[PDB]
Amino acid sequence: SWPAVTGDSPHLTNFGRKLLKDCRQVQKPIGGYENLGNVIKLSAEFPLEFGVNSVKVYRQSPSRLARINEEVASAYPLIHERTLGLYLQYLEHKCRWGNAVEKPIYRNLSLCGFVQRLLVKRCASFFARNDKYLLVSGESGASGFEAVGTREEKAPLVLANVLSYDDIKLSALLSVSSRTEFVNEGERTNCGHVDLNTKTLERHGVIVGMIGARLSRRNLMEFQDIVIARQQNTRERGYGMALDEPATTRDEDYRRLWREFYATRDLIHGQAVIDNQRFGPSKNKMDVFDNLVMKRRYAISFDMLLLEAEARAKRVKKLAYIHVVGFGLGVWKAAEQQERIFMETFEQRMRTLGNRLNNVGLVHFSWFSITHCGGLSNGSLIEIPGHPKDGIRVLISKRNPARKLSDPEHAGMLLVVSYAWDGNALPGNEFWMKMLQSTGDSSTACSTLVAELHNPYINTKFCNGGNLHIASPEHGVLHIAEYAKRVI
Ligand SMILES: Nc1ncnc2c1ncn2[C@@H]1O[C@H](COP(=O)(O)OP(=O)(O)OC[C@H]2O[C@H](O)[C@H](O)[C@@H]2O)[C@@H](O)[C@H]1O
């Protein structure tokens, strides 16, 4: 399955060659004892009020502060090695094809500095179809982001202060993961309620932010690569070019970035007729859904989930229990066949990675409408030759994210929780607008420590670009410095 595990070594131009070269000198931040003190103080200095206060560090039991200290040092941003090539190609593309507004931002941007831009320049909240937003600096509003990065952008929505839709398209491929304490079971309606003497709460594990495909904004983000529409998929906008056909405009070079990221052609309207294998229906009757590009986008995210859980479980010498949510299948779902592509691609990447998942024990698909998909069914086993437990258990049922792993079948495993995030929002998203129970994003920030540990304004040492980790199927999960040393 795609992407291939071996035979890789990304091509990289001279431009991306050097920026990855300069990453070999990025010092890996080392954790200590005063990590909690900086988080506690910077959390009090955060200019925005939390949705709930119970997830704050100072309200956790002091006997657990030593473990929370290690959890602060365990946080890092994370991208696929596939995405690393795209980031470097994007920087190169913006360096030459950027307008007068974009060029002062993107040139001389190191790789790690671009990741840092994708972390700090997010809005606090950024949701709904009309783009309701709240910035960390306090400004709020709705809409107005399509102008960001152009000649007629208006403050406070300027490229130097917020992200453009081109940035958000790449930020959707950027994840943040960390060990975490679980404040409550993590049901959607938890709203930060704490039951101090509960008997069913797995209190610590791993939390990983996954971002689905945003498909409802026309001509923007994953719509550009997955939905084949009349207005967008034209020859004048870069669509329909061959592999080595050189791009001579900005639109052609932008489409080249994504043709070569997904390793497939894009399509002009009319070339794609629904065959229900690569081309399926969308919600617009006159559009066409690219089932292949949707699979490859989910494939990238699933590699990050499985390789990250395998690294966390390997460090504590345990087996990973991955609580898998359907990111992009909730309020962001756009095709009825997305969930089938979701689970088909998940099982594909589980078999393709294979022995690279020797420390993954169980995959739990929670809140999915499909109950069986190929080898995936409740209680099934994805056979992997050489696996310590002969394979990976599959469970398909509604489950609270932090429900205690009390069963003897799962006793002592490392609970790895995925949650549906946003590329242009801090952990919780609408959590920062006092909406605590509307999505899995806001429910997670009410039940874990992501609002501080996955916050680049609070956990400044370990949640920055200088701590970027690369999920490579070949080399595992490594810090950006070690990945650069081992591929250059
Ligand atoms: N009550 C529920 N309990 C548990 N899971 C549920 C529930 N209802 C739906 N699900 C499943 O929860 C899963 C995820 O649904 P979502 O949380 O919308 O995620 P997305 O990726 O679609 O939308 C993310 C955007 O919305 C946020 O604001 C972000 O910040 C982004 O802006 C699906 O399988 C649902 O069926």
Numbering used by the authors: 11 to 498
What does the paper say about this structure?
ADP-ribosylation is a reversible post-translational modification involved in various cellular activities. Removal of ADP-ribosylation requires (ADP-ribosyl)hydrolases, with macrodomain enzymes being a major family in this category. Further analyses reveal DUF4804 as a class of MavL-like macrodomain enzymes whose representative members show unique selectivity for mono-ADP-ribosylated arginine residue in synthetic substrates. Crystal structures of several proteins in this class provide insights into arginine specificity and a shared mode of ADP-ribose interaction distinct from previously characterized macrodomains.
Encouraged by the clearly detectable ADPR-Ub hydrolytic activity of the two metazoan proteins, we solved their crystal structures in the ADPR-bound forms (ADPR-bound CG290912-498 at 2.28 Å and the ADPR-bound CG356825-508 at 2.00 Å). In addition, water molecules equivalent to w4 in MavL can be found in both structures with distances of 3.4 Å (in CG2909) and 3.3 Å (in CG3568), suggesting that this macrodomain class likely employs a similar catalytic mechanism. In MavL, the adenosine was stabilized by π-π stacking interaction provided by two aromatic residues (H142 and Y265), whereas in the two Drosophila proteins, a π-cation interaction involving an arginine (R198 in CG2909 and R209 in CG3568) replaces the imidazolium stacking. Interestingly, CG2909, CG3568, and Larg1 all harbor a hydrophobic residue (F137 in CG2909, F148 in CG3568, and V77 in Larg1) equivalent to F105 in MavL in their insertions. On the other hand, E107 in MavL also seems to have functionally equivalent residues in the other three enzymes (S226 in CG2909, E237 in CG3568, and E160 in Larg1), even though these residues are not in the insertions.
